[PDB]
Amino acid sequence: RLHRRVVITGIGLVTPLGVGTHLVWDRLIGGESGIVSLVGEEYKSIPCSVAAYVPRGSDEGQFNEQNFVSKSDIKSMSSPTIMAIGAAELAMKDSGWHPQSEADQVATGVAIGMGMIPLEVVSETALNFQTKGYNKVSPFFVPKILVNMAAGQVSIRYKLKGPNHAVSTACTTGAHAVGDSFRFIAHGDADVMVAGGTDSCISPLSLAGFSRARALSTNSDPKLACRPFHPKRDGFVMGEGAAVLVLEEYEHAVQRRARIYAEVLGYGLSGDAGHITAPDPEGEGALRCMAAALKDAGVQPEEISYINAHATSTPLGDAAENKAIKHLFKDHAYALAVSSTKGATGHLLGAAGAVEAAFTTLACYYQKLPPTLNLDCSEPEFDLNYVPLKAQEWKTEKRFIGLTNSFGFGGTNATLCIAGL
Amino acid sequence: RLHRRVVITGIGLVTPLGVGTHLVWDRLIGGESGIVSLVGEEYKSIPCSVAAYVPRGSDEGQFNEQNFVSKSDIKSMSSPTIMAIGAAELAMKDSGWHPQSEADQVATGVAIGMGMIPLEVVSETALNFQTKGYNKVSPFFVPKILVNMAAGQVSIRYKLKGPNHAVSTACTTGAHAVGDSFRFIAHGDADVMVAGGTDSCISPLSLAGFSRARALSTNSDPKLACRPFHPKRDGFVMGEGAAVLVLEEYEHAVQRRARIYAEVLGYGLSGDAGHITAPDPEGEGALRCMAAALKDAGVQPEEISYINAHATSTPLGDAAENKAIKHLFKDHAYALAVSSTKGATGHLLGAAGAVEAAFTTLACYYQKLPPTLNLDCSEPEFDLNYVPLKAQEWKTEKRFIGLTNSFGFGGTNATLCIAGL
Amino acid sequence: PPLTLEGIQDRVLYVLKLYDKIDPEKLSVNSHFMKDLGLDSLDQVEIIMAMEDEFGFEIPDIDAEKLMCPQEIVDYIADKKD
Ligand SMILES: *[C@@H](CCCCC)CC(=O)NCCNC(=O)CCNC(=O)[C@H](O)C(C)(C)COP(*)(=O)O
Numbered sequence: 001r002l003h004r005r006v007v008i009t010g011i012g013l014v015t016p017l018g019v020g021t022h023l024v025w026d027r028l029i030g031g032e033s034g035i036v037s038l039v040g041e042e043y044k045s046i047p048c049s050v051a052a053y054v055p056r057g058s059d060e061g062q063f064n065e066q067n068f069v070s071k072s073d074i075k076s077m078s079s080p081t082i083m084a085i086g087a088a089e090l091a092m093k094d095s096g097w098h099p100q101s102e103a104d105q106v107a108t109g110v111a112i113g114m115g116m117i118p119l120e121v122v123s124e125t126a127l128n129f130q131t132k133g134y135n136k137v138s139p140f141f142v143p144k145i146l147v148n149m150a151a152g153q154v155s156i157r158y159k160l161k162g163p164n165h166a167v168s169t170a171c172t173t174g175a176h177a178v179g180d181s182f183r184f185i186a187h188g189d190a191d192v193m194v195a196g197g198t199d200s201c202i203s204p205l206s207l208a209g210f211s212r213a214r215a216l217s218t219n220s221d222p223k224l225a226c227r228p229f230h231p232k233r234d235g236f237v238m239g240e241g242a243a244v245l246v247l248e249e250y251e252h253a254v255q256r257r258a259r260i261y262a263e264v265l266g267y268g269l270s271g272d273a274g275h276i277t278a279p280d281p282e283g284e285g286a287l288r289c290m291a292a293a294l295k296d297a298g299v300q301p302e303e304i305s306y307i308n309a310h311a312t313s314t315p316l317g318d319a320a321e322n323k324a325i326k327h328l329f330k331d332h333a334y335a336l337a338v339s340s341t342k343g344a345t346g347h348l349l350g351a352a353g354a355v356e357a358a359f360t361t362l363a364c365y366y367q368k369l370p371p372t373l374n375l376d377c378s379e380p381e382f383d384l385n386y387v388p389l390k391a392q393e394w395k396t397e398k399r400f401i402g403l404t405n406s407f408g409f410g411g412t413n414a415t416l417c418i419a420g421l
Numbered sequence: 422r423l424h425r426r427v428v429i430t431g432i433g434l435v436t437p438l439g440v441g442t443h444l445v446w447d448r449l450i451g452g453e454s455g456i457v458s459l460v461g462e463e464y465k466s467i468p469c470s471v472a473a474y475v476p477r478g479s480d481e482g483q484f485n486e487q488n489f490v491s492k493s494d495i496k497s498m499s500s501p502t503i504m505a506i507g508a509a510e511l512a513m514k515d516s517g518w519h520p521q522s523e524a525d526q527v528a529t530g531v532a533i534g535m536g537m538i539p540l541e542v543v544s545e546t547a548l549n550f551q552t553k554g555y556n557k558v559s560p561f562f563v564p565k566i567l568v569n570m571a572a573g574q575v576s577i578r579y580k581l582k583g584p585n586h587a588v589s590t591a592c593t594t595g596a597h598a599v600g601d602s603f604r605f606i607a608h609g610d611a612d613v614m615v616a617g618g619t620d621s622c623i624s625p626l627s628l629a630g631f632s633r634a635r636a637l638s639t640n641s642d643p644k645l646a647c648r649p650f651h652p653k654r655d656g657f658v659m660g661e662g663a664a665v666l667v668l669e670e671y672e673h674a675v676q677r678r679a680r681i682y683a684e685v686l687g688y689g690l691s692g693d694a695g696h697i698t699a700p701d702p703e704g705e706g707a708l709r710c711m712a713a714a715l716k717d718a719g720v721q722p723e724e725i726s727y728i729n730a731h732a733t734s735t736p737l738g739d740a741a742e743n744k745a746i747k748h749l750f751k752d753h754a755y756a757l758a759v760s761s762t763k764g765a766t767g768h769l770l771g772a773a774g775a776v777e778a779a780f781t782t783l784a785c786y787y788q789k790l791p792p793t794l795n796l797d798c799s800e801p802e803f804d805l806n807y808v809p810l811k812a813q814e815w816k817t818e819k820r821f822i823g824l825t826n827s828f829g830f831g832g833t834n835a836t837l838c839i840a841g842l
Numbered sequence: 843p844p845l846t847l848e849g850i851q852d853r854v855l856y857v858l859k860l861y862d863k864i865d866p867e868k869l870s871v872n873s874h875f876m877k878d879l880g881l882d883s884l885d886q887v888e889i890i891m892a893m894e895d896e897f898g899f900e901i902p903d904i905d906a907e908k909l910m911c912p913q914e915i916v917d918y919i920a921d922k923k924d
Contacts, residue, residue, distance in 0.1 A: 123547035152831025164692035168589035271585035410573025
C-alpha cells in the first residue's frame with residue numbers, strides 16, 4: 001500500500017545516571033555508573049546488596065517529583081507513574097510538540113508501559129485491610145496497581161487523543177512500547193507517539209523474589225557487581241528509571257522544523273520456546289528476532305555497525321546473545337561494535353528497552369559508542385569488540401545503523417533497528 | 422502482499438458459563454449466566470456480594486486443571502496462567518493447528534495478556550517474608566506475578582517461536598492482544614497468532630479495592646446485579662476466565678483446509694484524554710475508536726449490523742457508549758443490533774476483550790445475536806435494539822459485519838471490526 | 843447536649859479546607875463537589891473517609907454515593923442528633 005518513515009524527535013530520561021538528555025549521555029560516555037550499595041535494616045537477610053537508584057534532590061541532574069507533578073498527585077499515584085510523567089514532560093519539551101488543535105491531539109498517542117507493579121503498595125494495603133478493615137482502604141489502591149495509569153496521566157496532561165497502548169511485558173516493555181508505536185505510525189494510525197517504559201520496584205520483597213530465583217549478583221561491591229561479558233559475571237543488578245521517546249512521521253517532523261535524532265527502520269519479535277528462565281543456549285531466538293528486525297528495515301546484516309546488547313551480566317544470558325550475534329553477522333561480527341550499558345544504569349526492567357533505545361538513538365546522533373563497564377578482560381568465546389571500559393568513536397563507510405536488543409523472561413525477544421539520517 | 426487478509430480459525434473458552442466453544446455459545450444464546458453469590462467468611466466486610474466464577478469439576482463444560490497442566494505445574498503457576506494454557510490448548514485443538522515443522526513454529530506467535538496480577542499471591546508471600554524470613558520465599562514467586570508467563574508457557578508447550586507479545590492494559594488487554602496479532606499477521610511477521618486474555622483475581626482484597634473505587638454492584642441479587650443499559654445499573658460484576666483465538670493469514674488457512682469462523686477487517690484505538698475515572702459523557706473517544714476501526718477495515722458505518730458493546734452496567738459508561746453509537750451511525754443506528762454479554766459472564770477484565778471477540782466471531786459464523794440479560798425496563802435515552810432478554814436471528818442477505826468495543830480505565834478505547842466471510 | 847448543627851457544619855468545612863484538592867476560596871457550603879470544585883468520585887470517597895474520622899463513625903457506601911455537597915453531609919451527619 002504505502003510506507004511512511006518514522007523518526008525520533010524527543011528523549012526524556014530519568015535514570016540512575018541522573019535526569020536530562022545531554023547530562024545522562026555525557027555521564028554515560030564518560031564511564032559513570034549509578035550502581036550503589038543497599039543501606040537499611042529491611043535489606044538485611046537478602047543475599048543481594050547493590051542496586052541502582054535515580055538520584056533525588058534539587059541539584060541539576062537530580063529527579064525532583066515536585067517539578068513534574070502537583071502535591072495532590074504525589075500521594076495519589078505510584079513512584080513508577082511519577083517517573084513516567086517526568087520522563088514524558090522532558091521528552092515532549094525536548095520535542096517541542098505541544099498539540100493545541102483537535103487535529104493535532106487526535107494525531108498524537110501514548111504507549112507507556114510498566115514492567116511490574118510495586119509489590120509494597122499491595123502488601124501495605126493488604127495488611128491495612130486485614131487490621132483496620134474496608135473503610136480504611138484507599139480508593140486510589142486499584143489505580144496505583146494498573147499498568148496503564150502512566151499513559152493515562154500523560155494523555156490527560158498533554159491532551160493526547162490518539163492511540164493509547166499500555167503494555168507490560170516485564171523486561172521487554174520499553175522495546176515493545178517503541179516498536180508498536182513505530183508500527184502504528186508507519187501504518188497511519190497516528191502522526192506522533194509518546195512511547196517508553198518505567199520501573200521502580202526496588203523493594204525488600206522484590207529483591208528477595210529475584211534473589212531467590214538466583215537472578216541477582218551477590219557481589220557486595222557496587223563498583224564490580226555488574227560486568228557484562230566478563231568472566232566473573234554472577235547475575236544482574238536491579239535498577240529503576242523511566243525513558244520516553246517521541247516518535248513522529250518523517251514529513252510531519254520536517255515540516256514543523258523539529259530536531260531529529262534518528263530514524264526507526266525496523267522491529268522484530270521472537271520466542272525462544274526452549275524453557276522459562278533459561279535462554280536458548282545457541283541463541284536461536286535472539287538470532288530470529290534480530291533477523292526479523294533487519295528484514296523489516298530492508299537491511300542486510302553487513303550494514304549494521306553497532307549493537308546495544310541486552311547483556312545483563314548473567315553467565316548463560318551474555319553467552320547466548322553473543323552466540324546469536326556471531327551466527328547472524330558471520331565475518332562481519334568482527335567489524336561491528338557491541339556494548340551493554342547495564343554496568344552504568346543497572347537492569348531497568350520495564351524501562352530497560354526504552355532507555356537503551358534512547359542510547360542507541362544518541363549513539364547514531366553523535367557517532368559515539370558508550371562503553372561496557374568493568375570489562376577488564378574477556379574469555380575466548382567473547383572475541384568481538386565490546387567497547388571495553390572507554391567510549392569509542394563510531395566510524396563506518398556508509399550509514400550509521402544500530403540494533404538494540406531486549407530479551408525477557410519466558411523467552412520473549414525484541415529488537416529495534418535504529419539509524420542515523 | 423504487503424497487507425494480507427486475516428481470519429479466525431480457532432476459539433478456546435474458559436468462562437463462568439463453562440468451557441468449550443459449542444457449549445459456552447449455546448448457553449450464552451439460551452440466556453444463561455454465571456453470576457453467583459459470594460460464599461466466603463472473608464467477603465462479609467465488603468459491599469459487593471456477587472461475582473462470576475469458572476465452574477470447576479470434571480462434568481461436561483467444567484474446568485479441570487488436570488487435563489491441561491501437571492500436578493507440579495499447578496503449584497508453580499497462578500490461576501490465570503492455568504486458565505490461559507487451558508483456553509489455548511482448546512483453541513489450537515479447535516483450529517487443528519499443531520505446528521511440528523520448524524517453518525510452521527517460527528510462523529506461529531503468541532499474544533496472551535493478563536489484565537491484573539493476583540493480589541493474594543503477593544500478600545501471602547509478603548506476610549511469609551515478614552514473619553518467617555528470606556528462606557521462606559518461593560523461587561517461583563517472581564514468575565507467578567509476571568504478566569507474560571501465560572504466553573511463555575503456551576509458547577513452550579505448543580512450540581510457538583514466532584512473535585511473542587504479552588500486553589497488559591487492564592480491561593482492554595484481550596482487545597489489544599487480538600488487534601495487535603491482526604496487525605502482525607497483516608504486516609507479514611507471522612502466519613498464525615494464538616491470541617487472547619486471562620484474569621482470575623476474585624479475592625477479598627481485589628473486590629475491596631474495586632468496591633472502594635465505586636466500581637462494583639452493591640446489589641445482593643445475583644440474578645439482577647449486572648444489567649447493562651438498565652435504569653438501575655449500579656456497577657459491574659467481577660468475573661474470571663480466559664479466551665483464546667487462533668488468527669491466521671487467509672491463504673495459509675485455506676491451503677490447510679481449516680474451518681474459518683470469520684475475518685478480522687480492522688482495529689482502532691483512541692484515548693479520551695479527559696478524566697481518568699469517568700468516560701467522556703458524549704463518548705467522543707468511543708466514537709473516534711470505532712471510526713478508526715471502520716477506516717482500517719475500509720467500511721462505511723452503514724455496513725455494520727451488530728455491536729458487542731463494552732457496557733458493564735455502569736451509569737456513565739453505558740450512557741457514553743450509547744451516545745457514541747448514535748452519533749456515529751446516525752439513522753443506521755436504528756437498523757443495527759447492540760448487545761452486552763456482561764450480564765452472562767460478568768466483567769472478565771483482561772479477558773473481557775478476547776471473550777467478546779470470540780462472541781462477535783461466532784455471531785458472524787451463525788447469524789445469531791446473544792441477548793443483553795436483565796433488560797426488562799429501558800429509559801428513553803436508550804432507544805436502540807439492545808437484543809433484550811432473548812437472542813435474535815439476524816439473516817441479512819448482505820455480508821455480516823460486527824464491531825466489538827473495549828473501554829478501559831485511563832480513557833483508553835479499542836475496537837475490532839469482525840466479519841462473516 | 844451531643845451536637846450543634848452550626849458546629850457539625852464548622853467541622854465539615856474545617857475538614858474540606860484541609861483537603862489539598864479543594865481550593866478554600868471556592869468552597870461554599872452548597873458548592874457541588876464535582877460540578878463546582880472539580881473533584882471526581884475517588885476524591886469524594888476520600889472526603890467521606892476524612893468525615894468518617896472527624897465524627898468517628900462509619901458511613902455506608904450506599905449513603906455516601908448520595909452526598910454530593912457539604913450541606914448534604916451536614917444533614918446526614920445530623921441524623922444522629924436533632
Ligand atoms: C477497567 C479497569 C477496572 C476499573 C478500575 C477502577 C476499566 C473499564 O471497565 N473501563 C471503563 C468502562 N466503564 C466506564 O466507562 C466507567 C464509568 N465510570 C463509573 O461510573 C465509575 O464507577 C466511577 C469511577 C465511580 C465514576 O466516577 P465518579 O462517579 O466520577
